[PDB]
DNA sequence: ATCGGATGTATATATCTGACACGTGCCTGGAGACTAGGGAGTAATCCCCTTGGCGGTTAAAACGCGGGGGACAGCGCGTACGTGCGTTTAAGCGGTGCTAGAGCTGTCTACGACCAATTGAGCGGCCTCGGCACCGGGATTCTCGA
DNA sequence: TCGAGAATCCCGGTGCCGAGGCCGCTCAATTGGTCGTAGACAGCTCTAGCACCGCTTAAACGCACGTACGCGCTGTCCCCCGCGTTTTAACCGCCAAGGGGATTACTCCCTAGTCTCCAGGCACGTGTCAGATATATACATCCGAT
């Protein structure tokens, strides 16, 4: 009989495993794309460092677990183990990012 | 209303040119190239009056011209070009008018504190006169034909001349004449009588009717 | 002791805007307080900036560049241009 | 020796003299652009010409000759761009804009 | 009988109001504007990334409207090849249509959506209402002189509105024969007069005239002008259009790179070309005012006089 | 701008003239009045062609059929009478109107008339029968002026109470409304629509908008039911008659007045323009009872 | 621009620019029809250019006829009078807050009275200006109730 | 070489793996777009700001002490570049 | 027969006269004596400006206006009109007062 | 003259003032003394700060710009005081 | 006459003259006190010794000789004085330092 | 392009007080930038705090001063007492 | 869902006033004019990082696919919280009075500023080699059905 | 719940390049005068703070009490986790062109610095009305019976 581990076991060790590792999640070159895409958009034909974009996507994905992280918290405090997009809004809000 | 952006009667800023200066810490005024003309606040229609023009810078490329001019006087002429508007050109006292020159006049010096006397009665205008006067001394009579229309008190700059106009309870040296006026009395006047055209247009157009007494004043 | 402020001149661009409107000691002294502050917001940017330039002038297009960081999107617009007519006008002078 | 401020010789308020000699004695940079005062003032003028309008249409709003403080919160409050400005700055006298959530109202 | 090798990917073409100029699509997602007097490309415009599958020229001819496959709709000035205005929407955008008396106007019948006329002037957009309310697939096209709106549903319905309020002017139902709907293909019109044609599921052409079915009113019976098929081969129609008068019309035989030409008053088959029997037939125009049939297949255009 | 001068003069009418309209070939000029009376002219030499009489009271409108072979006649005898111009035979005389008919206008397939009353009710009328297959209380205030548009499926019609009402043929479905209005009709393309307002004022409207396009001022028409055209077969004008005995011609599309024809000693009430030439029948009132023809160059 | 090209611009486009239409200030009313920018020429009060003496006789001839004056004074000597022969600018509503603003202009020597815009006007909005008791309902949060 | 749509260039799975490290369990998928959003606006700012450094350096490539001043002004400094 | 108006309801007007009013909302001497316990913790015997003590009530009632306001927010995330001290602990977490 | 307990001398009518002036409907009462903590760690530092400028002051009394440019650097100015 | 690092005198490590070099250049005022760089260096190079030392302590539990920003980014977030001071700067190569919530324990 | 840095007091630093220990050169410039980052941090909370003293002599007082508003606890105790130490060593000769 | 009554709130009014607009005489920072240096600007050169492309891989992404797990809706109750009314209480006005300490001026002096002469601490550059990263494989431990 | 199985931990071995150590090679640090000056300090004010004390009262604390949201539990749906498969394009490695970045060397425009003079700003008086406050009033809105 085939085997499936319960809901979130495999996400928890998924979680722990990221905890341990360090490493980005993000795969460079869509990244970078995007980076560039919204480049065009103040000024177009504008070149980069890979130290320069090594380094926003790091400090984007420190940004982004930090929100993750403190909206994970909140959604504690909303009772719940799923996320709502009103956690993300409201987090933002306490962050004075609104 | 016509409310005038004014303390007192000065030289109205919407009938100057566009390369015309003020300075309203003596409100003189000054240009940059050629010939401009900038009129007062107020205009005679009758009576006589009187004022003043005070010289505070005439280098020798430099030759304002202080006058009289009508309605229909273009700003950018150097006031006395058209038939409508008298004045002197100040290097030597000479009387311009139609751009011609008359040397039926005074001598002019460079820091003369001019006084402008004028008569117009209540084709010649019958009677009508100007008189110049040099610090209340008289220069003489400047134009005696004087043709129909209001008139108001006009100064043309050359290249950066600094002139300014100027009313009778400051004045240096007033003729003690009972029935002249100065500039800021007659300003008032038209003040007062623009007030009370604007009374009647509202009047007119807003209640039927209208009715103004024995006609003589 | 002579304490220098702006209520002068923000009495003046008050009425070169409202003539009719008045004005509170109170927030008066805020105005004072705010102007102050985004001053030294934009010094010590533009210092930070031609710092990064290790430019030891400090000029006006680090203004601009700076200001421009500083003000959310279209103000700053509206700011430079009045900031180039300035110079425009003092640099015609 | 015609003397002329260069704020008259730009045509606005801000002192251009005094703000100079401000940073000068602010330590920022050895030298520095005569302009960049003016300039600085300019927008000074501008940014204080903006908060002070909204401010006076909250106080007219409110049949207020004298601008209060609350106009001014408010004010600062309403324009995004001037509150994202000023987010985390604070205001004395200023209070809180009028703000009821939606389930805060009984149905 | 006759083709262009200085284009490629040819995808979708349309004739200019006087048939001087055919403005082709490619698969780079560019506009090439070729001539037909001096046999060559008058333009060429970046349009999108993305194939244009959907090409319209304004009446003064100065304006086209062209769909990318990305849901990007884009107004380009002829002679500069500008970007005039560009509009995004959901159910990728299945045919765009500037409207013949109004060049300000321009309807677009999307994939899953209902058509929507938007104006360039305003961004504005009508969404056109939908009888059935469950077609998912409604074509829609503007008539000769852009006075009111064919729409045509996967389900055989057909509604007439008028082009300003959308109000049912008209409506009737197709049939199968027996009983049975057919998903409505496509809808064109003539240049002039007021005979249309109808390209449906069921590999039939029907032919109508207009104002036989504005006096036969909401939900009637109003039969075809002509009915016009392939009785030997049963071949289904890509692509089909009128001739310039409108006494000619023409189909696309994709199935096996064929054109079939028959009459309008008469209906006989005119004639039949045949095209490379490896090219896979996409596009098919004629010429407006000439005996000259343009046609896209496997991204090769070719030309047929007469 | 047009250059029209006076070429012929015509007259007859014992009482004052309500309507001139050219046939649609431009070989006649129909000419109605309130003497109970039309008269056919030649439309190019002012050659009086004959009088057609029949109907019991004055004649506030005639129009003529799309084949210039038919014209109705629109009567203060509260009736139409539908007569074949060859002939001259009353061929039909519609009865239902309860009061004053002031318009009449025929489909633009011909077979089919619009009608205006006193009654304030508009009637839809059969040719071939005569028969009256519609009756809408369109208005509230005796009808001015109705006409169809390019194809027949609209008519347009304004009456005293200032009201310009845009109804379905097939259903008598009110579809549009837009200063009480003497005139209306549609514009050629059927696009736009001019109505004169009893106040010196002429309106061209968009119909797909709904909203007034253009003004034409300088005229004077404030009682009358002054009559509006296109002028086409020259430059692109807009040609109306005037209180003041001119005859007004504006510019189409700048609104300014390109041409001011003077000749007439009372109030221009009715014009026509030319189908094909650049010909103008200018009739006025009793005061000169007289139509005059007017040819330009452009 | 020269005033001159200006105007001629603005004579060839005023056709196009501005409507008139159902108003809920008052009756009917200009709006516009394309956005227009701050300051530019949106419309000539075109009419007959006559001497200030004469309005009197022109005003009580109107009031014997009992047709409403359409005149705006130019200056103390001319006013254009469109009582009887104007343009659509007869038609221009007023409010406390204008978009508008009434200027004089002298092309070739003849005065011209022309509305220009107080700001960037956009498509639809209706077109007024400061005519400078008749209760007024300009909807303007400023009115002062009355133009008088 | 016009650029476009490269937001939704961010996989689920990426989105999901960097929630995992922030240590969440159970995700909506209403969350991902927006959160893609708030990246898209987060970055909105940095980089225009950056290359407003750039702005004032006169130069067409962008530097990473570009964003290292920004992030500091934005109060989000940033080590390990200089 | 007494009456008594629903809950929430005059605390409801209470919120709308507070927005409505700009005055401090704290008695003077409580906070005066709080200021400067707290000082006599740094150094004892210091004094103090009834402007400078002034701007501590009004600053710090800021401040607290400011996280009741966000707390308030983070609630409605909770679905409650109930507070609940965890938002407030949270509420400073998101504002990075942890 | 050695102070206490002043905190509970915050009154729960002026906490839930405050509450109210940020729109709060219902309240719990644990909160208090837990906001008053808050107060008091938040005051926490800034006097203390305060003085520290005080303390280069070298002066006894503490001024208002002393907690002006405490709130400065504790990233939450405030104005009219100088 | 011998020329003897400042620091040496100060018995410390990071380069005083340095120090004292970025002081004059850095613009704070218009002259540095004597002894004031040496202070501040010597604040610094104590706190970098603690810094240090955490890592080393991380790096060795992690059985790990070469430290890596892992380890310090987890003393940072092990150290509640050194993260308030920090936790408004970001971590280059940091992640997140174990946190486990406690509703998200399973049973 | 001579650049200056510190990586070399750092290991001598940390060889005094971890010998047997290697580091990344990414984790030495990130410690770098630490460096430069709390320079930065206390030199301009100096300058500031010397402006409103208006002084233009920084000196070991602000410096400690400036500390004391920044580290916490005894972080700031300490480095108070190390500084202290240090400019007593460095004026002792 | 309405009406009646209670209550709370927006308004007009009157006057009081104390902030506040306004004007002064006097001060000094700002303007005006003049001199120097040297930061900044420009240009030619080098480098060299970047941006571009090309091919092979697969780990990763896309997508599908149950399906148990919890989001959520509802439902009972109950305890905790608004409220209005009691009570008592410090809060505020205000005005008094002392001076400790800010807050100012006048020295005088140590103290960097600064420059010049000197150089070795430090930094770019070059080997080098060993913890470290990867890999494969074996043993350990969690987990899901009994 | 005791196994099966699966993901993981750890162990040994392989090969590597960054960490590090050392080497030329300065310029920036030190040293030592020298000088004008920041402020250290003394020594005055005066005032704002600090405390005193009384008087009034709005305010605060507690009570009782209804009540209604918080909370706890159930069942449902759906939906996101987990795994399997299929597709792809990130990556990675290499190559190549140039275009910008950085550099250096001149060159000089502009600003710092100085000195002069005064005029706008500032402290300081001075009437004076915007609005604060209180009161009666008219309007809005909740709450309960119907």
Same mark, same amino acid.
């Not at chain 2, 005074?106 to 004028?118: A, E, P, T």
């Not at chain 3, 002294?29 to 030294?40: A, L």
């Not at chain 5, 194939?51 to 496959?69: F, I, Q, Y």
């Given at each position: 009989?085939?085997?499936?581990?319960?809901?979130?076991?495999?996400?928890?060790?998924?979680?722990?495993?990221?905890?341990?590792?360090?490493?980005?999640?993000?795969?460079?070159?869509?990244?970078?794309?995007?980076?560039?895409?919204?480049?065009?958009?103040?000024?177009?034909?504008?070149?980069?460092?890979?130290?320069?974009?090594?380094?926003?996507?790091?400090?984007?994905?420190?940004?982004?677990?930090?929100?993750?992280?403190?909206?994970?918290?909140?959604?504690?405090?909303?009772?719940?183990?799923?996320?709502?997009?009103?956690?993300?809004?409201?987090?933002?809000?306490?962050?004075?990012?609104? | 209303?016509?409310?005038?952006?004014?303390?007192?009667?000065?030289?109205?800023?919407?009938?100057?040119?566009? +390369?015309?200066?003020? #300075?309203?810490?003596?409100?003189?005024?000054?240009?940059?190239?050629?010939?401009?003309?900038?009129?007062?606040?107020?205009?005679?229609?009758?009576?006589?009056?009187?004022?003043?023009?005070?010289?505070?810078?005439?280098?020798?490329? =430099?030759?304002?011209?202080?006058?009289?001019?009508?309605?229909?006087?273009?700003?950018?002429?150097?006031?006395?070009?058209?038939?409508?508007?008298?004045?002197?050109?100040?290097?030597?006292?000479?009387?311009?008018?139609?751009?011609?020159?008359?040397?039926?006049? #005074?001598?002019?010096? +460079?820091?003369?504190?001019?006084?402008?006397?004028?008569?117009?009665?209540?084709?010649? =205008?019958?009677?009508?006169?100007?008189?110049?006067?040099?610090?209340?001394?008289?220069?003489?009579?400047?134009?005696?034909?004087?043709?129909?229309?209001?008139?108001?008190?006009?100064?043309?700059?050359?290249?950066?001349?600094?002139?300014?106009?100027?009313?009778?309870?400051?004045?240096?040296?007033?003729?003690?004449?009972?029935?002249?006026?100065?500039?800021?009395?007659?300003?008032?006047?038209?003040?007062?009588?623009?007030?009370?055209?604007?009374?009647?247009?509202?009047?007119?157009?807003?209640?039927?009717?209208?009715?103004?007494?024995?006609?003589?004043? | 002791?002579?304490?220098?402020?702006?209520?002068?001149?923000?009495?003046?661009?008050?009425?070169?805007?409202?003539?009719?409107?008045?004005?509170?000691?109170?927030?008066?002294?805020?105005?004072?307080?705010?102007?102050?502050?985004?001053?030294?917001?934009?010094?010590?940017?533009?210092?930070?900036?031609?710092?990064?330039?290790?430019?030891?002038?400090?000029?006006?297009?680090?203004?601009?560049?700076?200001?421009?960081?500083?003000?959310?999107?279209?103000?700053?617009?509206?700011?430079?241009?009045?900031?180039?007519?300035?110079?425009?006008?003092?640099?015609?002078? | 020796?015609?003397?002329?401020?260069?704020?008259?010789?730009?045509?606005?308020?801000?002192?251009?003299?005094?703000?100079?000699?401000?940073?000068?004695?602010?330590?920022?940079?050895? $030298?520095?652009?005569?302009?960049?005062?003016?300039?600085?003032?300019?927008?000074?003028?501008?940014?204080?010409?903006?908060?002070?309008?909204?401010?006076?249409?909250?106080? $007219?709003?409110?049949?207020?000759? $004298?601008?209060?403080?609350?106009?001014?919160?408010?004010?600062?409050?309403?324009?995004?761009?001037?509150?994202?400005?000023?987010?985390?700055?604070?205001?004395?006298?200023?209070?809180?804009?009028?703000?009821?959530?939606?389930?805060?109202?009984?149905? | 009988?006759? %083709?262009?090798?200085?284009?490629?990917?040819?995808? %979708?073409?349309?004739?200019?109001? /006087?048939?001087?100029?055919?403005?082709?699509?490619?698969?780079?997602?560019?506009?090439?504007?070729?001539?037909?007097?001096?046999?060559?490309?008058? *333009?060429?415009?970046?349009?999108?990334?993305?194939?244009?599958?959907?090409?319209?020229?304004?009446?003064?001819?100065? *304006?086209?409207?062209?769909?990318?496959?990305?849901?990007?709709?884009?107004?380009?000035?002829?002679?500069?090849?500008?970007?005039?205005?560009?509009?995004?929407?959901?159910?990728?955008?299945?045919?765009?249509?500037?409207?013949?008396?109004?060049?300000?106007?321009?309807?677009?019948?999307?994939?899953?959506?209902?058509?929507?006329?938007?104006?360039?002037?305003?961004?504005?957009?009508?969404?056109?209402?939908?009888?059935?309310?469950?077609?998912?697939?409604?074509?829609?096209?503007?008539?000769?002189?852009?006075?009111?709106?064919?729409?045509?549903?996967?389900?055989?319905?057909?509604?007439?509105? *008028? %082009?300003?309020?959308?109000?049912?002017?008209?409506?009737?139902?197709?049939?199968?024969?027996?009983?049975?709907?057919?998903?409505?293909?496509?809808?064109?019109?003539?240049?002039?007069?007021?005979?249309?044609?109808?390209?449906?599921?069921?590999?039939?052409?029907?032919?109508?005239?207009?104002?036989?079915?504005?006096?036969?009113?909401?939900?009637?019976?109003?039969?075809?002008?002509?009915?016009?098929?392939?009785?030997?081969?049963?071949?289904?129609?890509?692509?089909?259009?009128?001739?310039?008068?409108?006494?000619?019309?023409?189909?696309?035989?994709?199935?096996?790179?064929?054109?079939?030409?028959?009459?309008?008053?008469?209906?006989?088959?005119?004639?039949?070309?045949?095209?490379?029997?490896?090219?896979?037939?996409?596009?098919?125009? /004629?010429?407006?005012?000439?005996?000259?049939?343009?046609?896209?297949?496997?991204?090769?255009?070719?030309? /047929?006089?007469? | 701008?047009?250059?029209?001068?006076?070429?012929?003069?015509?007259?007859?009418?014992?009482?004052?003239?309500?309507?001139?309209?050219?046939?649609?070939?431009?070989?006649?000029?129909?000419?109605?009045?309130?003497?109970?009376?039309?008269?056919?002219?030649?439309?190019?030499?002012?050659?009086?062609?004959?009088?057609?009489?029949?109907?019991?009271?004055?004649?506030?409108?005639?129009?003529?059929?799309?084949?210039?072979?038919?014209?109705?006649?629109?009567? &203060? &005898?509260?009736?139409?009478?539908?007569?074949?111009?060859?002939?001259?035979?009353?061929?039909?005389?519609?009865?239902?109107?309860?009061?004053?008919?002031?318009?009449?206008?025929?489909?633009?397939?011909?077979?089919?008339?619009?009608?205006?009353?006193?009654?304030?009710?508009?009637?839809?009328?059969?040719?071939?029968?005569?028969?009256?297959?519609?009756?809408?209380?369109?208005?509230?205030?005796?009808?001015?002026?109705?006409?169809?548009?390019? &194809?027949?499926?609209?008519?347009?019609?304004?009456?005293?109470?200032?009201?310009?009402?845009?109804?379905?043929?097939?259903?008598?479905?009110?579809?549009?409304?837009?200063?009480?209005?003497?005139?209306? @009709?549609?514009?050629?393309?059927?696009?736009?629509?001019?109505?004169?307002?009893?106040?010196?004022?002429?309106?061209?409207?968009?119909?797909?908008?709904?909203?007034?396009?253009?003004?034409?001022?300088?005229?004077?028409?404030?009682?009358?039911?002054?009559?509006?055209?296109?002028?086409?077969?020259?430059?692109?004008?807009?040609?109306?008659?005037?209180?003041?005995?001119?005859?007004?011609?504006?510019?189409?599309?700048?609104?300014?007045?390109?041409?001011?024809?003077?000749?007439?000693?009372?109030?221009?009430?009715?014009?026509?323009?030319?189908?094909?030439?650049?010909?103008?029948?200018?009739?006025?009132?009793?005061? &000169?009872?007289?139509?005059?023809?007017? @040819?330009?160059?452009? | 621009?020269?005033?001159?090209?200006?105007?001629?611009?603005?004579?060839?486009?005023?056709?196009?620019?501005?409507?008139?239409?159902?108003?809920?200030?008052?009756?009917?009313?200009?709006?516009?029809?394309?956005?227009?920018?701050?300051?530019?020429?949106?419309?000539?009060?075109?009419?007959?250019?006559?001497?200030?003496?004469?309005?009197?006789?022109?005003?009580?001839?109107?009031?014997?006829?009992?047709?409403?004056?359409?005149?705006?004074?130019?200056?103390?000597?001319?006013?254009?009078?469109?009582?009887?022969?104007?343009?659509?600018?007869?038609?221009?509503?007023?409010?406390?807050?204008?978009?508008?603003?009434?200027?004089?202009?002298?092309?070739?020597?003849?005065?011209?009275?022309?509305?220009?815009?107080?700001?960037?006007?956009?498509?639809?909005?209706?077109?007024?200006?400061?005519?400078?008791?008749?209760?007024?309902?300009?909807?303007?949060?400023?009115?002062?109730?009355?133009?008088? | 070489?016009?650029?476009?749509?490269?937001?939704?260039?961010?996989?689920?799975? !990426?989105?999901?793996?960097?929630?995992?490290?922030?240590?969440?369990?159970?995700?909506?998928?209403?969350?991902?777009?927006?959160?893609?959003?708030?990246?898209?606006?987060?970055?909105?700012?940095?980089?225009?700001? !950056?290359?407003?450094?750039?702005?004032? !350096?006169?130069?067409?490539?962008?530097?990473?002490?570009?964003?290292?001043? !920004?992030?500091?002004?934005?109060?989000?400094?940033?080590?390990?570049?200089?």
């Amino acid at each position: 009989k085939p085997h499936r581990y319960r809901p979130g076991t495999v996400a928890l060790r998924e979680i722990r495993r990221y905890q341990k590792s360090t490493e980005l999640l993000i795969r460079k070159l869509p990244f970078q794309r995007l980076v560039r895409e919204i480049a065009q958009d103040f000024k177009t034909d504008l070149r980069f460092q890979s130290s320069a974009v090594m380094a926003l996507q790091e400090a984007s994905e420190a940004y982004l677990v930090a929100l993750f992280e403190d909206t994970n918290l909140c959604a504690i405090h909303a009772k719940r183990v799923t996320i709502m997009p009103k956690d993300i809004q409201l987090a933002r809000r306490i962050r004075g990012e609104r | 209303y016509r409310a005038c952006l004014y303390e007192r009667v000065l030289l109205a800023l919407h009938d100057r040119a566009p +390369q015309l200066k003020i #300075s309203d810490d003596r409100l003189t005024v000054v240009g940059e190239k050629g010939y401009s003309m900038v009129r007062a606040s107020h205009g005679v229609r009758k009576g006589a009056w009187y004022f003043e023009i005070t010289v505070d810078e005439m280098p020798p490329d =430099t030759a304002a011209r202080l006058g009289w001019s009508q309605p229909l006087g273009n700003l950018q002429a150097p006031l006395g070009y058209d038939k409508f508007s008298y004045s002197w050109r100040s290097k030597k006292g000479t009387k311009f008018h139609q751009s011609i020159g008359k040397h039926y006049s #005074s001598g002019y010096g +460079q820091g003369d504190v001019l006084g402008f006397y004028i008569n117009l009665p209540e084709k010649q =205008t019958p009677h009508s006169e100007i008189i110049f006067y040099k610090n209340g001394v008289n220069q003489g009579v400047a134009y005696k034909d004087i043709f129909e229309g209001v008139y108001f008190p006009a100064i043309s700059l050359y290249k950066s001349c600094t002139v300014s106009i100027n009313f009778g309870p400051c004045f240096k040296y007033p003729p003690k004449d009972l029935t002249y006026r100065p500039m800021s009395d007659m300003g008032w006047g038209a003040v007062v009588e623009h007030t009370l055209a604007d009374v009647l247009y509202h009047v007119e157009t807003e209640v039927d009717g209208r009715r103004s007494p024995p006609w003589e004043p | 002791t002579r304490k220098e402020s702006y209520a002068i001149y923000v009495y003046k661009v008050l009425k070169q805007v409202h003539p009719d409107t008045g004005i509170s000691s109170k927030a008066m002294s805020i105005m004072n307080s705010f102007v102050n502050d985004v001053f030294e917001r934009i010094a010590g940017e533009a210092s930070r900036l031609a710092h990064y330039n290790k430019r030891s002038t400090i000029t006006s297009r680090e203004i601009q560049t700076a200001v421009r960081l500083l003000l959310p999107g279209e103000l700053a617009k509206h700011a430079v241009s009045e900031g180039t007519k300035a110079v425009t006008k003092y640099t015609s002078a | 020796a015609k003397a002329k401020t260069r704020s008259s010789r730009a045509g606005l308020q801000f002192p251009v003299g005094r703000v100079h000699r401000l940073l000068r004695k602010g330590n920022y940079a050895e $030298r520095v652009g005569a302009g960049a005062p003016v300039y600085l003032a300019a927008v000074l003028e501008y940014l204080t010409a903006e908060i002070l309008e909204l401010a006076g249409n909250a106080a $007219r709003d409110n049949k207020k000759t $004298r601008i209060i403080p609350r106009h001014l919160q408010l004010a600062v409050r309403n324009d995004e761009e001037l509150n994202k400005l000023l987010g985390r700055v604070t205001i004395a006298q200023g209070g809180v804009l009028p703000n009821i959530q939606s389930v805060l109202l009984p149905k | 009988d006759g %083709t262009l090798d200085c284009i490629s990917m040819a995808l %979708t073409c349309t004739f200019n109001r /006087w048939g001087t100029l055919l403005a082709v699509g490619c698969n780079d997602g560019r506009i090439v504007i070729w001539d037909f007097l001096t046999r060559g490309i008058a *333009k060429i415009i970046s349009a999108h990334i993305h194939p244009v599958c959907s090409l319209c020229w304004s009446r003064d001819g100065h *304006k086209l409207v062209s769909a990318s496959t990305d849901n990007i709709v884009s107004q380009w000035d002829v002679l500069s090849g500008d970007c005039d205005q560009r509009f995004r929407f959901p159910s990728p955008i299945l045919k765009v249509q500037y409207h013949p008396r109004d060049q300000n106007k321009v309807l677009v019948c999307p994939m899953k959506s209902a058509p929507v006329m938007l104006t360039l002037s305003d961004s504005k957009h009508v969404v056109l209402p939908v009888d059935d309310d469950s077609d998912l697939n409604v074509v829609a096209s503007f008539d000769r002189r852009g006075e009111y709106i064919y729409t045509g549903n996967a389900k055989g319905k057909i509604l007439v509105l *008028k %082009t300003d309020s959308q109000d049912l002017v008209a409506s009737f139902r197709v049939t199968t024969g027996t009983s049975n709907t057919t998903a409505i293909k496509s809808i064109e019109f003539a240049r002039k007069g007021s005979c249309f044609l109808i390209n449906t599921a069921d590999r039939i052409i029907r032919v109508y005239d207009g104002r036989e079915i504005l006096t036969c009113g909401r939900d009637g019976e109003p039969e075809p002008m002509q009915k016009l098929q392939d009785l030997v081969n049963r071949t289904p129609w890509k692509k089909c259009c009128f001739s310039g008068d409108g006494e000619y019309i023409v189909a696309g035989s994709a199935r096996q790179h064929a054109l079939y030409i028959w009459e309008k008053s008469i209906g006989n088959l005119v004639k039949i070309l045949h095209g490379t029997r490896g090219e896979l037939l996409l596009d098919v125009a /004629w010429h407006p005012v000439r005996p000259i049939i343009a046609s896209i297949s496997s991204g090769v255009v070719s030309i /047929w006089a007469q | 701008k047009p250059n029209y001068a006076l070429k012929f003069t015509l007259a007859g009418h014992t009482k004052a003239v309500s309507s001139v309209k050219f046939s649609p070939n431009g070989e006649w000029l129909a000419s109605s009045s309130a003497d109970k009376l039309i008269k056919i002219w030649g439309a190019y030499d002012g050659k009086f062609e004959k009088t057609i009489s029949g109907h019991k009271l004055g004649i506030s409108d005639v129009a003529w059929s799309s084949d210039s072979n038919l014209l109705v006649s629109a009567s &203060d &005898d509260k009736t139409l009478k539908i007569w074949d111009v060859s002939s001259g035979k009353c061929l039909k005389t519609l009865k239902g109107h309860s009061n004053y008919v002031f318009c009449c206008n025929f489909n633009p397939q011909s077979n089919l008339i619009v009608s205006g009353s006193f009654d304030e009710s508009v009637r839809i009328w059969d040719v071939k029968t005569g028969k009256c297959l519609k009756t809408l209380p369109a208005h509230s205030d005796p009808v001015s002026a109705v006409h169809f548009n390019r &194809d027949g499926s609209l008519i347009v019609s304004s009456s005293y109470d200032g009201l310009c009402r845009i109804w379905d043929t097939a259903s008598g479905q009110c579809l549009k409304t837009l200063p009480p209005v003497s005139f209306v @009709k549609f514009s050629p393309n059927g696009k736009y629509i001019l109505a004169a307002t009893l106040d010196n004022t002429l309106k061209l409207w968009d119909y797909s908008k709904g909203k007034c396009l253009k003004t034409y001022t300088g005229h004077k028409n404030e009682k009358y039911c002054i009559f509006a055209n296109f002028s086409v077969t020259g430059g692109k004008w807009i040609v109306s008659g005037s209180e003041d005995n001119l005859v007004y011609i504006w510019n189409l599309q700048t609104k300014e007045i390109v041409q001011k024809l003077q000749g007439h000693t009372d109030v221009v009430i009715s014009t026509a323009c030319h189908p094909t030439e650049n010909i103008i029948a200018s009739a006025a009132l009793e005061n &000169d009872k007289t139509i005059k023809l007017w @040819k330009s160059d452009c | 621009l020269p005033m001159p090209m200006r105007f001629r611009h603005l004579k060839k486009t005023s056709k196009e620019a501005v409507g008139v239409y159902r108003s809920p200030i008052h009756g009917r009313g200009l709006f516009c029809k394309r956005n227009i920018d701050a300051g530019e020429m949106v419309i000539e009060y075109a009419g007959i250019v006559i001497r200030s003496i004469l309005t009197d006789k022109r005003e009580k001839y109107y009031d014997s006829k009992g047709i409403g004056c359409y005149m705006f004074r130019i200056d103390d000597s001319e006013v254009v009078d469109a009582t009887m022969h104007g343009n659509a600018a007869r038609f221009i509503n007023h409010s406390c807050e204008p978009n508008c603003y009434s200027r004089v202009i002298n092309i070739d020597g003849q005065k011209h009275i022309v509305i220009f815009a107080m700001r960037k006007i956009y498509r639809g909005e209706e077109l007024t200006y400061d005519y400078k008791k008749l209760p007024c309902n300009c909807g303007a949060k400023k009115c002062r109730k009355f133009l008088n | 070489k016009v650029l476009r749509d490269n937001i939704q260039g961010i996989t689920k799975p !990426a989105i999901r793996r960097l929630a995992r490290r922030g240590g969440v369990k159970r995700i909506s998928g209403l969350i991902y777009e927006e959160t893609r959003g708030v990246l898209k606006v987060f970055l909105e700012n940095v980089i225009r700001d !950056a290359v407003t450094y750039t702005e004032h !350096a006169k130069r067409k490539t962008v530097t990473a002490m570009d964003v290292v001043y !920004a992030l500091k002004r934005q109060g989000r400094t940033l080590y390990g570049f200089g």
